[PDB]
Amino acid sequence: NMTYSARIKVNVQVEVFDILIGSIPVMVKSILCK
Amino acid sequence: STMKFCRECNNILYPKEDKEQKILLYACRNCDHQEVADNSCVYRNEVHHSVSERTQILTDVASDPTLPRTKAVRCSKCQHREAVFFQATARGEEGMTLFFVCCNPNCGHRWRE
Amino acid sequence: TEEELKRLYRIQKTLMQMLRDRGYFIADSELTMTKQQFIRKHGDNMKREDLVTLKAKRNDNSDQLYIFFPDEAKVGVKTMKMYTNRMKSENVFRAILVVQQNLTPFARTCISEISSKFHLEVFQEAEMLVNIKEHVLVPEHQVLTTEEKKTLLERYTVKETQLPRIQVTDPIARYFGLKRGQVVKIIRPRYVTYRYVV
Amino acid sequence: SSDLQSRKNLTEEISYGLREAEQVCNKQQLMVESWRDFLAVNGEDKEEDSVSDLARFCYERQKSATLSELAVSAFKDAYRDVQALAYRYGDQSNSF
Amino acid sequence: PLRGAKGKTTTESYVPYGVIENSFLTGLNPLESFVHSVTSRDSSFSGNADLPGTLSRRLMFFMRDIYAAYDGTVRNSFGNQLVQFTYETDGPVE
Amino acid sequence: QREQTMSLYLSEYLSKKKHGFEYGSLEIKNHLEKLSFSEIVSTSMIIFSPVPLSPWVCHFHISEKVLKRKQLSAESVVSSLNEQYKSRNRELKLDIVDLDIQNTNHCSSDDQAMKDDNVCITVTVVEASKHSVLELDAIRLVLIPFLLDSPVKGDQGIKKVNILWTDRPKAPKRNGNHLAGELYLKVTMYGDRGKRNCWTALLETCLPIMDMIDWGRSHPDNIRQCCSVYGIDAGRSIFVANLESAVSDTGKEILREHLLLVADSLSVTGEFVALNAKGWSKQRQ
Amino acid sequence: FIVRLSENEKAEDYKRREKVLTVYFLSTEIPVWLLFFALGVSSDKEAMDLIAFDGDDASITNSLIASIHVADAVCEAFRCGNNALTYVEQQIKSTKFPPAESVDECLHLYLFPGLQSLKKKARFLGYMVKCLLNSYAGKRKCENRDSFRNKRIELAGELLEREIRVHLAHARRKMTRAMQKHLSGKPIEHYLDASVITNGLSRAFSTGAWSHPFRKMERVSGVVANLGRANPLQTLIDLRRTRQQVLYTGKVGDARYPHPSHWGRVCFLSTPDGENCGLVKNMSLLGLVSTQSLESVVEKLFACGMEELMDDTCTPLFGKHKVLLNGDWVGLCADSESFVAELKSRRRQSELPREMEIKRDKDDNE
Amino acid sequence: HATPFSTPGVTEITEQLHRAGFSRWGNERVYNGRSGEMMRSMIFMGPTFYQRLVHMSEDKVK
DNA sequence: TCTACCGATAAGCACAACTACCTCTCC
RNA sequence: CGAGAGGUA
DNA sequence: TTGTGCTTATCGGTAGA
Numbered sequence A: 001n002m003t004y005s006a007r008i009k010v011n012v013q014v015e016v017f018d019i020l021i022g023s024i025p026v027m028v029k030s031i032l033c034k
Numbered sequence B: 001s002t003m004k005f006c007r008e009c010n011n012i013l014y015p016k017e018d019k020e021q022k023i024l025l026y027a028c029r030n031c032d033h034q035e036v037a038d039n040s041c042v043y044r045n046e047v048h049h050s051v052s053e054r055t056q057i058l059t060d061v062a063s064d065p066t067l068p069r070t071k072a073v074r075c076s077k078c079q080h081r082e083a084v085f086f087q088a089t090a091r092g093e094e095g096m097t098l099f100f101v102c103c104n105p106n107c108g109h110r111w112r113e
Numbered sequence C: 001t002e003e004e005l006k007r008l009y010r011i012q013k014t015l016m017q018m019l020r021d022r023g024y025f026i027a028d029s030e031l032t033m034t035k036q037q038f039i040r041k042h043g044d045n046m047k048r049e050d051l052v053t054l055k056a057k058r059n060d061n062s063d064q065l066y067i068f069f070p071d072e073a074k075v076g077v078k079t080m081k082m083y084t085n086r087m088k089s090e091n092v093f094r095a096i097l098v099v100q101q102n103l104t105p106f107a108r109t110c111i112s113e114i115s116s117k118f119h120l121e122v123f124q125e126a127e128m129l130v131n132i133k134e135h136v137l138v139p140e141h142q143v144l145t146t147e148e149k150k151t152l153l154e155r156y157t158v159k160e161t162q163l164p165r166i167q168v169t170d171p172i173a174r175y176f177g178l179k180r181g182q183v184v185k186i187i188r189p190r191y192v193t194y195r196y197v198v
Numbered sequence D: 001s002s003d004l005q006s007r008k009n010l011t012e013e014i015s016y017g018l019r020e021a022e023q024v025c026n027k028q029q030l031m032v033e034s035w036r037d038f039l040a041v042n043g044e045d046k047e048e049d050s051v052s053d054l055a056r057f058c059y060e061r062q063k064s065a066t067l068s069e070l071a072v073s074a075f076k077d078a079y080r081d082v083q084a085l086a087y088r089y090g091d092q093s094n095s096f
Numbered sequence E: 001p002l003r004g005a006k007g008k009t010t011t012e013s014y015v016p017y018g019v020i021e022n023s024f025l026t027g028l029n030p031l032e033s034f035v036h037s038v039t040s041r042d043s044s045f046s047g048n049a050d051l052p053g054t055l056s057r058r059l060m061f062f063m064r065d066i067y068a069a070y071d072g073t074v075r076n077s078f079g080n081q082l083v084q085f086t087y088e089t090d091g092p093v094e
Numbered sequence F: 001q002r003e004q005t006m007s008l009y010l011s012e013y014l015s016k017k018k019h020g021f022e023y024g025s026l027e028i029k030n031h032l033e034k035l036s037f038s039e040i041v042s043t044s045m046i047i048f049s050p051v052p053l054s055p056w057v058c059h060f061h062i063s064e065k066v067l068k069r070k071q072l073s074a075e076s077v078v079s080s081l082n083e084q085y086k087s088r089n090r091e092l093k094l095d096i097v098d099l100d101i102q103n104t105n106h107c108s109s110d111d112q113a114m115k116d117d118n119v120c121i122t123v124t125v126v127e128a129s130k131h132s133v134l135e136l137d138a139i140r141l142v143l144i145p146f147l148l149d150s151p152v153k154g155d156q157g158i159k160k161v162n163i164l165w166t167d168r169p170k171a172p173k174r175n176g177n178h179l180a181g182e183l184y185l186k187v188t189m190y191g192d193r194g195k196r197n198c199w200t201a202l203l204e205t206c207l208p209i210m211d212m213i214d215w216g217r218s219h220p221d222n223i224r225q226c227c228s229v230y231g232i233d234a235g236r237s238i239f240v241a242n243l244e245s246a247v248s249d250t251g252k253e254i255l256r257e258h259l260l261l262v263a264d265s266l267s268v269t270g271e272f273v274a275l276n277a278k279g280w281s282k283q284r285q
Numbered sequence G: 001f002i003v004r005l006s007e008n009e010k011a012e013d014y015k016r017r018e019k020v021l022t023v024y025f026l027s028t029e030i031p032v033w034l035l036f037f038a039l040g041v042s043s044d045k046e047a048m049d050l051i052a053f054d055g056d057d058a059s060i061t062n063s064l065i066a067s068i069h070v071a072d073a074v075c076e077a078f079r080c081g082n083n084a085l086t087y088v089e090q091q092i093k094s095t096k097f098p099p100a101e102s103v104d105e106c107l108h109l110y111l112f113p114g115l116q117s118l119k120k121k122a123r124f125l126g127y128m129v130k131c132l133l134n135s136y137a138g139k140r141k142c143e144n145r146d147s148f149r150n151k152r153i154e155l156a157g158e159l160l161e162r163e164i165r166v167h168l169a170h171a172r173r174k175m176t177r178a179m180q181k182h183l184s185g186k187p188i189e190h191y192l193d194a195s196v197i198t199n200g201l202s203r204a205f206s207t208g209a210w211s212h213p214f215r216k217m218e219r220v221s222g223v224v225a226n227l228g229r230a231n232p233l234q235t236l237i238d239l240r241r242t243r244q245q246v247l248y249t250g251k252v253g254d255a256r257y258p259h260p261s262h263w264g265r266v267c268f269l270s271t272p273d274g275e276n277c278g279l280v281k282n283m284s285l286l287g288l289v290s291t292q293s294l295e296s297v298v299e300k301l302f303a304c305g306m307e308e309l310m311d312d313t314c315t316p317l318f319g320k321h322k323v324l325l326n327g328d329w330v331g332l333c334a335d336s337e338s339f340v341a342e343l344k345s346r347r348r349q350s351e352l353p354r355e356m357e358i359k360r361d362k363d364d365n366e
Numbered sequence H: 001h002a003t004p005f006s007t008p009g010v011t012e013i014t015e016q017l018h019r020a021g022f023s024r025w026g027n028e029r030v031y032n033g034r035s036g037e038m039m040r041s042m043i044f045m046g047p048t049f050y051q052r053l054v055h056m057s058e059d060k061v062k
Numbered sequence I: 001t002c003t004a005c006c007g008a009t010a011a012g013c014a015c016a017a018c019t020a021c022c023t024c025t026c027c
Numbered sequence J: 001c002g003a004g005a006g007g008u009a
Numbered sequence K: 001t002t003g004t005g006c007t008t009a010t011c012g013g014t015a016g017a
């Protein structure tokens, strides 16, 4: 009774003069599925 | 409904009337050019009653009414009482004459009054 | 202007028929007259003045109603005042006003303020062209008297309120000149029914 | 049907009846005020043009309401006779 | 006419009208089946059923208070209002 | 209601003449049916003719075939246009005093000569020595749309008239019910939103033709205004007839007593109230 | 960009009230002739040549004359100089939320972004006005919502895309608010919220409410449904469905009956009986949904023989048809038949994307 | 094959059923199981494919 | 000479769009 | 306890 | 998405003293 989702990572660089954003549900037999 | 363009300014001309010349002239508001007019015609439109565009199919406007039907006259070739009657001029006669056409699908007979 | 002449002839014929149906002793000469006789006995121009007559009831000679034709349309309060003064002087209690256009609100207030003293009826020329009573759909209407009303109420043991209602503005009520509190007997083509004018 | 020949005869009869019903509908569609000159007993040279344009009648019918209703009524009247063929081509022991 | 406009002056609406020569025993062409489905889509009990119920309710709310009394007259529940003096009763043995 | 369907029955004195009913119905239809002036004119144009005191004149060319079909003439349509202009004269808020219309079979127009059997109608404006009408836009947008909508036959109130045949009319004959057919006419008039009723306006239009229309059976098709015109009983009878017709068309058989009871219950207070809550509240009040 | 043909209400008297052409661009309500002369046009004859009506009608001419007069009365000396540009800039700057860009910048990236040249967009506007006039005259039929030719479907590439975008926007707003509250008075792993998007997606999938394509509020229902395990046929037909969003499904109207465009795409014989009849359509066995193409077909189209669109507005077209790519005018073709035949031949030889439609109609000549 | 838009003709079905040794119209002579007498009219019999729905009688008792 | 009610027409706002049941699935 | 979608007569 | 009412309200719009 849990969610079949995959985490999303993207690098963020802060300039002053890979973090976790969310998990998207994964469809069965998609490009990322066992 | 008749628009023309000046040969020098290539802009729309506006009709006007001259009191001294008593003639029709066309002048544009951008350049001071007054040319002579032809046929003295400033408007021409064919009278058409198609003001309801894309609406005459859904709504029955009844542009062509149906001919009336009567059951008093009796046909000759067949014993059918239903017939359509209307008034129309003859080939050369003057006036309106009442006609009768049998409504029997198997008769197809027409006669005059 | 013969169209106006025949319009006035139809109006006069309908008014005479209504008066005869209401029981005002209308002579057969005024009922069986033709258009040719009507225009021969009229003259050159009537100016809506010769039609002003005075008719009394057949049973009682004291009761009388006078039909008044206004000289012009869009009548105001001066003509109403003159008519009221004439009715007071001649001692008449009923009058019929055959007007051309609709009355003014001031005329309505004037005719409603003095309704208790005298009763007035207003008819349009467009309504008096065809006789309403002479129709296949309109059944026979019979106005009941006080004794008949009392007997009807006593026989069914029912109050006057607990009866079918007919509004005063109905064409039949104005045709018969019915007031509030009078019942009518209707025969349908047998069973009969009664309507209470409210 | 009793056999194959009866079935073929019934099919041909149904086709001819439908064609006759369509012709009757097209004839009935001409009962309008626009054809009063053609319906009169006179000399008109446009008799062939009324029957040459067969596909235009359908378009003229489907664009109108009164014409469509008249066509439906005429088609039902002419199709009653077509429906009346089951008693001729049907047997007494037919369950339907 | 099936392709939008019958050769253009253009058209905006149509009233479909077609005749199917084939029957249900010999089979139906796909265009014939399409025509039949379009024609038969108008048949639905639940598509238009609120109107009879509303009419029945509004008529019952008017007619439920009408009864006949011992005097032979047809009265009303509110104030004993008189509606009909006599019931029609073509056959009066009742 | 906007449709305001009416019903007019023919008189019984037309049976003496052969095919009298058909001729009478056709004459009535030709008399009280609206025919706009736009349906008669084929080409409308404005020509700069230049005391006329009219800088712009309006040309309306009408083919003789249309006039022959509609049984009209140039003088008749000119008189009708003049009568329409002088009757209302409430529109055209311009500095125009009068308006004279001329008739000429042949006009000095060299622009086109495609039709040789088409007459020309010239509309000339009248100006009291001013230049307030010398503009073309105002004329084109006011005078042209005005007279094209002015009817040449019938009145503006009546929209369409059709001839129908019936076997069970709502209004039966006096006593001669032997015949089982009639050729009455159905009249549809524009909804008069004012205090004037459509029946009264129809009575005024039919003044020239009164004896042909049987007024002892003619009744409005509507239920509510019939009660005001002829009385509550006539409206109740028409309501009962319509209810019987609806029941028969529904395919069911219903006894007369139920329909009579419904009709009498819906007209207790002398007025046919609606089936909503407002009608019930008014009836109880 | 909306062009509307309606009567004139601004600076209009009782006598002059007739249909005119108006332009609704950035909520400005500007006349069409001012926009025409602002986009590199300096002659009425050229503007009329651009709008090639090619028909005889009095109403169209009257409407054009009225539009010209309205444009002349709105701005004085609008033909000479840059008065039209100043007027349109003033109209744009008068809005409640005007853009920060100038008149020149707003005419490039906001008005027809697909056309880089300032004169080609004038020709596109002229073509649009010509199409509107032809539709008004009755020579061209209007678009209908029942046909699949004017409808597109989105399963997951755009249905979840807007939800992801709005959740990301909300997360960014929360992050910047937290940064403004925290900077004045830190790793980037704490400012960005990692649970808001997940919770929003979970709520959307559970409650079934989905974001409206055109409205921020008023979430629509019926987008996400459940599956059935009674038989595999039920779960096969549940995965292949199309939903038509109609307000007040009680009165569907025209979008209930099968359309001729449903030939081979959706089943016209099996619809759910009930309130949603006709709204839900089951896809056919030979049904495929086209995806977005990654390669550009401009070079391939130019290689077939298509010529570029003329930059100058003074040179008209004689018989050259119009080539439209995704609603964008990309060039002209001399003969449409041979061009379409060659394009189809190239497509059949695995030289063009297979999910491409080539339409050639002799009515619109494009 | 029973393809919807490619159904075989009725004559083909009748011939196929006739070649199997039965009547061409699908009806066969039956005998009453209660009295043993032979019925006058033949009864049409055939192995049609039926389905069982999820609605049960005991699920509606209230 | 200057209103006092009366009338026609947008306009914006409301209530209403059938019964008796059985299911799942978030709260 | 309500709410949302499907179905039965 | 319409179907009826229902109340403002909004301009004239007539007499009218």
Ligand SMILES: */O=C1\[N]C([N])=NC2=C1N=[C]N2[C]1O[C]([C]OP([O])(=O)OP([O])(=O)OP([O])([O])=O)[C]([O])[C]1[O]
Pocket (backbone or CB within 6 Å): E045, E046, E049, I018, I019, J009
């Ligand atoms: O919306 C409805 N309102 C209402 N009062 N009754 C109703 C509604 N919807 C369905 N019904 C009831 O259903 C039956 C329909 O009959 P059905 O489909 O069960 O049997 P048949 O004989 O009509 O059709 P088939 O299956 O071919 O044999 C109605 O009677 C109604 O009461």
Ligand SMILES: [Zn+2]
Pocket (backbone or CB within 6 Å): B006, B008, B009, B010, B011, B012, B028, B030, B031, B033
């Ligand atoms: Zn110039």
Ligand SMILES: [Zn+2]
Pocket (backbone or CB within 6 Å): B075, B076, B077, B078, B079, B080, B102, B103, B104, B107, B108, B109
């Ligand atoms: Zn005959």
Ligand SMILES: [Zn+2]
Pocket (backbone or CB within 6 Å): F059, F060, F061, F107, F108, F109, F120, F121
């Ligand atoms: Zn002329």
